[PDB]
Design a protein around this ligand. Structure first.
Ligand SMILES: Nc1nc2c(ncn2[C@@H]2O[C@H](COP(=O)(O)OP(=O)(O)OP(=O)(O)O)[C@@H](O)[C@H]2O)c(=O)[nH]1
Ligand SMILES: Nc1ncnc2c1ncn2[C@@H]1O[C@H](COP(=O)(O)OP(=O)(O)CP(=O)(O)O)[C@@H](O)[C@H]1O
Ligand SMILES: CO[C@H]1C[C@H]2CC[C@@H](C1)N2c1c(-c2c(F)cc(F)cc2F)c(Cl)nc2ncnn12
Ligand SMILES: Nc1nc2c(ncn2[C@@H]2O[C@H](COP(=O)(O)OP(=O)(O)O)[C@@H](O)[C@H]2O)c(=O)[nH]1
Ligand SMILES: [Mg+2]
Ligand SMILES: [Mg+2]
Ligand SMILES: [Mg+2]
Lengths: 413, 54, 435, 339
């Protein structure tokens, strides 16, 4: 049950670095790779994410970018020195916020070097369950090169699970003009080539930091929020709970294309309070309102020492009081796991994973920005200038519009 | 209300009470189905790899 | 002496297997080292317990059992548990990645690659058998391995050992202790394929056991350990007639002969009393016998009052005499709603073993002087099929999760084919128990 | 808050029960196929009892007792009374009945045997056949048995109590509610469904005079009382003025005894006391009163309608004792029949 982790682009590597920072603490590994933990429960599944060297643990992580900047930043602050130096794969050109450059030109010359690193990590896996990618869909490297990586990994490992933590464009906050192009072209790829995609939105992350939780939030704050979630959704995989990526996907994904998840996190709060918080919209990290759709499936993970009989009461309560928001035709679609080791600084926490048709609002929002620009062919020449054809845009748009109508179909069924 | 077939032993005993009277595929067929499914898998992977090569 | 081979498939089958063989060892005075002081035959003997244990020259008693799982997490615990030395490594078989709660993945993709290895290990056990009665198959309905590989195995066992009898102990899926949404699919798929290969199947619903554990042993959130400890008691009661000197159900074929007048309707309901918490600080023969007709003590929650009996067996352990049983039956026959099919006599087959039920030290079940397990073939158990078929219909109408099965090489037709068979089964039960 | 579903729309009683639950504000009506409810107002036929009581964390309740049909079908009731030790054929309050099957388990021969013992002794030999349509009242078994074209042949009550003025027969309907604890509650308000035509012993051909169904009677009507519905206050006053007796003494004691006998007979067969789901149900009992003021059971309705005047009160009674006793909210109208 080994997982190979890839992070691509600036957002991808910043979030990925924070993730390893967090779970290394949980497994009690220090910035040199040495284990200094109090419990042996920390190392029973440590192989899922780490290689053994020797008394030193090394993340099975591959760091990718088209410019050396962010990679250097990763290497600087701790836990920067835990990563295998030959697992840093970077170019020098950058992608200029251009999906085409990441996917077709600049990215293509770098992609073989990544696959060699992927291949070498995979061969030291006794039985690779699959891959996880952390990236953003707005820019050029994480979006363009990231989806290229996914496609080429699928070609060489067609029977392995591919999961992504994908940062999606925000409803109102953007710093990239060509973002709707990069995102729509990425989604097209994601729909076909990933098994599960966790949708992360920066605006939502900021509002949580700014309101609920800490004035003047920075990217470090948002990245820490994502890491907490990433720690949460992967708790079952690296601790003793039965279980693996494929078993998770089988129970979360009733329809192959509808595999985009809305993650959530909570929080001296009590169980009943934890439960009602993690279901609240403001605790959602994907800026979609669950109250605008219905849940196909839901996975909740509770961490810490707590009354598990009480937890099941709370889980059932909430569904019973909101049975309108869960599909009737998928019996027992709400599941719950509990892990006794809590995250750090918290007595207990809860992680929410919803497969909700409300996520269609995200894609129809992406779609309406995309079509606004593409109808006038605005900024299109930067993409066709890298060799792309207009038809590839029309296809990406049509596919995502198709995705939206499918969510609507099952929302009403 | 009858009791019959009272067998008895060291270990224990058994009996019957009556309250009222009344009034496969071959190993080849399995192999064929397992291989047909394997072929449908092979075909599906072939299409994916063809699609990816394109 | 006619031997019995036990096969434990998937997580549920293996973990229950652990509880059963632990309990077996306690009942026969076999230690975790495998030595049996009371057995003065050494490296030999024809005794009744020999049907479940073979013997080595060093006086080690070894279970006639195979443990098989498609991933190693569960069986590795056996390999390193208290009773580890009881098994030879041959016996424990593991794959490296499981069926992911996918019947198709367990039956087709992974089943094809491990079926031969499993049969060869079983063959090794059969080779050590002078006379072989058949197999006892432990598995869940809901797991990928439990559903998918078991059904494959059952077909192959029918080929390799056509004469031999096959008995299932099957775990019915319950949402309270289940993490899989696709269990309804796996259950009716494995039931369809395994139906003509099973002579008698004992279904246990995790919902019933969960509740018996909460309300009778005062456990707020039962664990698998709690559930399996209880399940092993029911299983022990059912298999005790094979491991001990007796005249009722001594050979696997008696089960079908006594409990199953119809081949397809081979799912007897089990009921067990008394269940009392060890903590808490007794029940007469008539009281535990009457308890057997209470829905709350059944392995499957259903209402026999609105169904018809085809056969009934009472299995007593501990202090019980025949006249008391006859007396209790008479008073129950008056009060409670018991009806039998017209073509069957309204009667009971009764077995009594003097050895009282045994209990694992530090467990939750307090020792009982007298205990009884009732096995009855009632049409009321069909309630469990209808429940399961309804959940199946809800999801299959939208083809939810179906792509996971087609992607492993299964055809969409097998879904409908299986569902149709279940529908026929439901009708069979209606024709027999309803007028 | 609680949730419920509606299986059968055509139910007048539980349509009213439906509105009053919604009105309370603390009850949500889910779609009929949604299996996450606490209350189920179910269909009249092939209700899926087998699926009830298996949703975790949901106390489920249904408005029907599984197996109550033993009481509520006319062939079933006859078989039940004849074969139950409790009734023991010691049922002096049920008309001599027989189960006949069309020639197209039967007791057609014993019926003729009793019919002929009667005609040897010149005893009144009028019978009624049943299973608005499908009933024939004849003084001869031949006319009864050529209706053979499952049925019940029942001894016709040739000396019914007849209301004055009018010389007219009538039927009494009692509403009985059994809760989840199998408490038996008798609605204090009964109704008398009257014939508007004088009774005639010579002519059974014109069925309407003989029968009392509100359906047949509908089609003089409403002349003596509105909609041929006399309620208990008037009837009790009539009994006092005409026969120098009361409804409680002359009739109600017998009614309570019969209701008790029937429901206690089937209690071990249908009780949900120790089940995973629980049942309540409303029944309509139909009685006829002869001239010697003896009460006879005619039929038990499992799915009864109410009288328009009383639809308000009874449906509120159901919500109070049968539903709110399981699902509490944020001068009883029932008489409790003890065991
Ligand atoms: N009673 C009982 N039920 C169990 C146990 N383990 C799992 N189950 C039930 O079995 C179903 C899951 O099947 P498993 O037996 O875990 O699956 P498996 O056979 O290992 O299948 P894969 O893991 O998919 O290869 C769920 O309904 C669980 O509730 C157990 O130890 N005891
Ligand atoms: N033995 C008997 N003697 C005299 N009258 C009788 C009788 N049996 C039935 N009746 C009359 O038949 C009428 C209707 O019979 P019954 O009630 O069985 O029909 P039904 O079942 O279709 C209407 P419901 O179901 O509401 O009672 C009653 O009003 C009663 O007056
Ligand atoms: C339009 O520009 C966007 C990109 C850059 C520049 C401004 C701001 C928003 N933003 C941020 C944010 C930030 C924020 F403040 C509010 C918000 F809703 C989401 C964010 F991601 C943070 Cl949290 N940390 C930052 N560090 C460097 N920029 N930067
Ligand atoms: N959450 C988060 N977002 C970031 C971070 N750095 C950049 N981003 C955002 O990512 C989006 C662009 O994607 P980016 O990764 O920078 O482009 P790429 O390097 O070509 O993949 C912009 O909206 C940035 O604001 C970070 O550290 N955390
Ligand atoms: Mg950049
Ligand atoms: Mg398993
Ligand atoms: Mg009627």
């Amino acid at each position: 049950r080994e997982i190979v982790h890839i992070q691509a682009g600036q957002c991808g590597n910043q979030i990925g670095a924070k993730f390893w920072e967090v779970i290394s603490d949980e497994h009690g590994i220090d910035p040199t790779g040495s284990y200094h933990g109090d419990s042996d429960l920390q190392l029973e599944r440590i192989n899922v994410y780490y290689n053994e060297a020797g008394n030193k643990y090394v993340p099975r992580a591959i760091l990718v970018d088209l410019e050396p900047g962010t990679m250097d930043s990763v290497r600087s602050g701790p836990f920067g020195q835990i990563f295998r130096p030959d697992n840093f794969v970077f170019g020098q050109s950058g992608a200029g916020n251009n999906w085409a450059k990441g996917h077709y030109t600049e990215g293509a010359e770098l992609v073989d070097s990544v696959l060699d690193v992927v291949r070498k990590e995979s061969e030291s896996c006794d039985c690779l369950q699959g891959f996880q990618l952390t990236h953003s869909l707005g820019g050029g490297t994480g979006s363009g090169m990231g989806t290229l990586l996914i496609s080429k990994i699928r070609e060489e490992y067609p029977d392995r699970i591919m999961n992504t933590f994908s940062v999606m464009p925000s409803p109102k906050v953007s710093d990239t003009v060509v973002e709707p192009y990069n995102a729509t072209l990425s989604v097209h790829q994601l729909v076909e080539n990933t098994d599960e995609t966790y949708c992360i939105d920066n605006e939502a992350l900021y509002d949580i930091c700014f309101r609920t939780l800490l004035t003047t939030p920075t990217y470090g704050d948002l990245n820490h929020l994502v890491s907490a979630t990433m720690s949460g959704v992967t708790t079952c995989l690296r601790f003793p709970g039965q279980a693996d990526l494929r078993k998770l996907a089988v129970n979360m994904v009733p329809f192959p294309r509808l595999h985009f998840f809305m993650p959530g996190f909570a929080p001296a709060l009590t169980v009943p309070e934890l439960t009602q918080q993690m279901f609240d919209s403001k605790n959602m990290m994907a800026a979609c309102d669950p109250r605008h759709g219905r849940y196909l499936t839901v996975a909740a993970i509770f961490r810490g020492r707590m009354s598990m009989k009480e937890v099941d009461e709370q889980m059932l309560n909430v569904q019973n009081k909101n049975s309108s928001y869960f599909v009737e035709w998928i019996p027992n679609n709400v599941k719950t796991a509990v892990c006794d080791i809590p995250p750090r600084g918290l007595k207990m926490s809860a992680t929410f994973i919803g497969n909700s048709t409300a996520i269609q609002e995200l894609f129809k929002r992406i779609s309406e920005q995309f079509t606004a620009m593409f109808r006038r062919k605005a900024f299109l020449h930067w993409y066709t200038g890298e060799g792309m054809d207009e038809m590839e845009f029309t296809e990406a748009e049509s596919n995502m519009n198709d995705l939206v109508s499918e969510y609507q179909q099952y929302q009403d069924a | 209300m009858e009791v019959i077939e009272l067998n008895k032993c060291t270990s224990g005993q058994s009996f019957e009470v009556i309250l009222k009277p009344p009034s496969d595929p071959s190993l080849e067929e399995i192999q064929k189905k397992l291989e047909a499914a394997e072929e449908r898998r092979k075909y599906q992977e072939a299409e994916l790899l063809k699609h990816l090569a394109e | 002496m006619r031997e019995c081979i036990s096969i434990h498939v998937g997580q549920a089958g293996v973990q229950i297997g652990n509880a059963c063989w632990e309990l077996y060892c306690l009942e026969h005075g076999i230690q975790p080292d495998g030595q049996m002081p009371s057995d003065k035959t050494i490296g030999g003997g024809d005794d009744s317990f020999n049907t479940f244990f073979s013997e080595t020259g060093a006086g080690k008693h070894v279970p006639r059992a195979v443990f098989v799982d498609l991933e190693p997490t569960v069986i590795d615990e056996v390999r390193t548990g208290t009773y580890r030395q009881l098994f030879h490594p041959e016996q424990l078989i593991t794959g490296k990645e499981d069926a992911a709660n996918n019947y198709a993945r367990g039956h087709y993709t992974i089943g094809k690659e491990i079926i031969d290895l499993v049969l060869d290990r079983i063959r090794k056990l059969a080779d050590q058998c002078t006379g072989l009665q058949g197999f006892l198959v432990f598995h869940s309905f809901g797991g990928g391995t439990g559903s998918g590989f078991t059904s494959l195995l059952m077909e192959r066992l029918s080929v390799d050992y056509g004469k031999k009898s096959k008995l299932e102990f099957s775990i019915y899926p319950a949402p309270q202790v289940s993490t899989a949404v696709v269990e309804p699919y796996n259950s009716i798929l494995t039931t369809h394929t395994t139906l003509e290969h099973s002579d008698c199947a004992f279904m246990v619903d995790n919902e019933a056991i969960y509740d018996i554990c909460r309300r009778n042993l005062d456990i707020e959130r039962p664990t698998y350990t709690n559930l399996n400890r209880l399940i092993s008691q029911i299983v022990s009661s059912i298999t005790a007639s094979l491991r001990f000197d007796g005249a009722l159900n001594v050979d696997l074929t008696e089960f079908q002969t006594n409990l199953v007048p119809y081949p397809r309707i081979h799912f007897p309901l089990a009921t067990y009393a008394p269940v009392i918490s060890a903590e808490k600080a007794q029940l007469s023969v008539a009281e535990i016998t009457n308890a057997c007709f209470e829905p709350a003590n059944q392995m499957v929650k259903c209402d026999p009052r609105h169904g018809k009996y085809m056969a009934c067996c009472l299995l007593y352990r501990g202090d019980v005499v025949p006249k008391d049983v006859n007396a209790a039956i008479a008073t129950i026959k008056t009060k409670r709603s018991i009806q039998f099919v017209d073509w069957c006599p309204t009667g009971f087959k009764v077995g009594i073993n003097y050895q009282p039920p045994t209990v694992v030290p530090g467990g939750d079940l307090a020792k009982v002087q007298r205990a009884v397990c009732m096995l009855s073939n009632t049409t009321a158990i069909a309630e469990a099929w209808a429940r399961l078929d309804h959940k199946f219909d809800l999801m299959y109408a939208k083809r939810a999760f179906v792509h996971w099965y087609v992607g492993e090489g299964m055809e969409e037709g097998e879904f409908s084919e299986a569902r149709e068979d279940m529908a026929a089964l439901e009708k069979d039960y209606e024709e027999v128990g309803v007028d | 808050m609680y949730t419920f579903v509606v299986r059968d729309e055509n139910s007048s009683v539980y349509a009213e029960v439906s509105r009053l639950l919604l009105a309370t504000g603390q009850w949500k009506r889910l779609r009929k196929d949604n299996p996450r409810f606490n209350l189920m107002l179910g269909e009249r036929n092939r209700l899926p009892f087998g699926r009830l009581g298996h949703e975790p964390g949901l106390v489920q309740l249904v408005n029907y007792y599984r197996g109550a049909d033993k009481l509520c079908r006319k062939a079933s009731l006859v078989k039940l009374i004849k074969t139950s030790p409790e009734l023991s054929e010691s049922c002096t309050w049920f008309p001599e009945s027989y189960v006949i099957y069309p020639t197209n388990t039967d007791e057609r021969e014993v019926f003729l045997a009793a019919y002929n013992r009667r005609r040897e002794g010149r005893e009144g030999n009028v019978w009624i056949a049943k299973s608005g349509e499908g009933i024939l009242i004849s003084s001869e078994a031949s006319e009864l048995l050529d209706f053979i074209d499952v049925h019940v042949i029942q001894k016709y009550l040739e000396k019914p109590l007849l209301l004055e003025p009018g010389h007219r027969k009538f039927d009494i309907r009692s509403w009985v509610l059994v809760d989840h604890l199998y408490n038996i509650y008798l609605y204090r308000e009964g109704v008398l469904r009257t014939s508007s035509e004088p009774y005639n012993s010579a002519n059974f051909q014109d069925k309407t005079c003989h029968l009392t169904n509100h359906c047949i009677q509908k089609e003089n009507y409403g002349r003596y009382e509105e909609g041929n519905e006399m309620f208990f206050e008037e009837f009790n006053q009539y009994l006092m003025d005409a026969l120098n007796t009361t409804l409680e003494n002359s009739i109600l004691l017998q009614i309570k005894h019969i209701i008790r006998s029937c429901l206690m007979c089937i209690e071990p067969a249908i009780s949900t006391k120790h089940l995973h789901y629980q049942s309540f149900q409303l029944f309509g009992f139909d009685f006829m009163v002869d001239e010697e003021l003896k009460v006879w059971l005619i039929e038990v309705n499992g799915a009864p309608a109410c009288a328009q005047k009383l639809y308000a009160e009874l449906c509120q009674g159901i919500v109070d004792v049968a539903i709110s006793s399981v699902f509490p909210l944020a001068t009883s109208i029932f008489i409790k029949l003890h065991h």
